[PDB]
Amino acid sequence: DRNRIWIVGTNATYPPFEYVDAQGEVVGFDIDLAKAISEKLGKQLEVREFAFDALILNLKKHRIDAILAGMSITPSRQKEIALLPYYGDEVQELMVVSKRSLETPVLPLTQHSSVAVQTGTFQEHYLLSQPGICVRSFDSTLEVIMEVRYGKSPVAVLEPSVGRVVLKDFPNLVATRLELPPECWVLGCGLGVAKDRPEEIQTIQQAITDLKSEGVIQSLTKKWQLSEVAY
Ligand SMILES: NC(=[NH2+])NCCC[C@H](N)C(=O)O
Structure with missing residues (x-):
C-alpha cells in the first residue's frame, strides 16, 4: 500500500x-x-x-x-x-503523598529524609528550586509510589490529576495539598x-x-x- x-x-x-x-x-x-x-x-x-x-x-x-x-x-x-x-x-497545587501511618507531619517537605518525584517534570523542577528539599527522582509514577509504599521515602509528590486517579488503587496512602506560588502555575x-x-x-x-x-x-x-x- x-x-x-x-x-x-x-x-x-x-x-x-x-x-x-x-x-x-x-x-x-x-x-x-x-x-x-x-x-x-x-x-x-x-x-x-x-x-x-x-x-x-x-x-x-x-x-x-x-x-x-x-x-x-x-x-x-x-x-x-x-x-x-x-x-x-x-x-495551582501539587499533591504530597504519604502513608496514613506516617508519624511525622507531611509538611514541611524540608523535614523528610527524601521526597520522591518523577524525573524531567515541572514538579521535580519546583522541588529542586526549594532550599532544604532532598529530592529523589524516578523514571515512572509507579516507581515513585512504590518508594513510599515500602517505606524508602516518607513522601512523594504527584500532580493533582495523576494523584487522583492512581491513589484510588493505594488506599493506605493519603494526599495533602501543597500550593504553588503563581509564578510556578x-x-x-x-x-x-x-x-x-x-x-x-x-x-x-x-x-x-x-x-x-x-x-x-x-x-x-x-x-x-x-x-x-x-x-
Ligand atoms: N509521559 C510523562 N512522563 N509525562 C510527565 C509529565 C509531567 C508533567 N505534566 C510535566 O509536563 O512536566
Missing part, C-alpha cells in the same frame, strides 16, 4: 495518559487520543518512546512528528515548541508540534476541535477516569 506515517513521541511511564498495563501493552488516554487524531489526519500512527526530557529536542530535530506525553503547557516550553491544549486546566496538557510549522499546527488544531465537537475526547476522559470538574 501507500502508508503515510505519523510519529508520536511519548514516555510511557505516566498513567492514565500512557503506561504499560497488566498485559504488557502501551495504553492510555494519550494513546487513544493519538489514534483518534491520526484518523482525522488520514495517517497511520506510530508510537515511539523517549526519555521525557528528550521529547522536545526530538520534536525539534524531526525525529518525531508530535508529542503526546501528558505534557504541561508552560511558558518556558512554549518558547521552544507549539503546544496545542487538549486536556485539563490551570494547575502551569496550564493543561498540550500536544507538541514543531513551532515553525504554522501549517501542521492548524491541521492538528482542527483535528482536536473536531473530536471535541464530536464528544470523542470527553468519552476518552471518562474511559480513563480523567473527567474532572473537581477542579
Whole structure:
C-alpha cells in the first residue's frame, strides 16, 4: 500500500495518559487520543518512546512528528515548541503523598529524609528550586509510589490529576495539598508540534476541535477516569 506515517513521541511511564498495563501493552488516554487524531489526519500512527526530557529536542530535530506525553503547557516550553491544549486546566497545587501511618507531619517537605518525584517534570523542577528539599527522582509514577509504599521515602509528590486517579488503587496512602506560588502555575496538557510549522499546527488544531465537537475526547476522559470538574 501507500502508508503515510505519523510519529508520536511519548514516555510511557505516566498513567492514565500512557503506561504499560497488566498485559504488557502501551495504553492510555494519550494513546487513544493519538489514534483518534491520526484518523482525522488520514495517517497511520506510530508510537515511539523517549526519555521525557528528550521529547522536545526530538520534536525539534524531526525525529518525531508530535508529542503526546501528558505534557504541561508552560511558558518556558512554549518558547521552544507549539503546544496545542487538549486536556485539563490551570494547575495551582501539587499533591504530597504519604502513608496514613506516617508519624511525622507531611509538611514541611524540608523535614523528610527524601521526597520522591518523577524525573524531567515541572514538579521535580519546583522541588529542586526549594532550599532544604532532598529530592529523589524516578523514571515512572509507579516507581515513585512504590518508594513510599515500602517505606524508602516518607513522601512523594504527584500532580493533582495523576494523584487522583492512581491513589484510588493505594488506599493506605493519603494526599495533602501543597500550593504553588503563581509564578510556578502551569496550564493543561498540550500536544507538541514543531513551532515553525504554522501549517501542521492548524491541521492538528482542527483535528482536536473536531473530536471535541464530536464528544470523542470527553468519552476518552471518562474511559480513563480523567473527567474532572473537581477542579
Ligand atoms: N509521559 C510523562 N512522563 N509525562 C510527565 C509529565 C509531567 C508533567 N505534566 C510535566 O509536563 O512536566
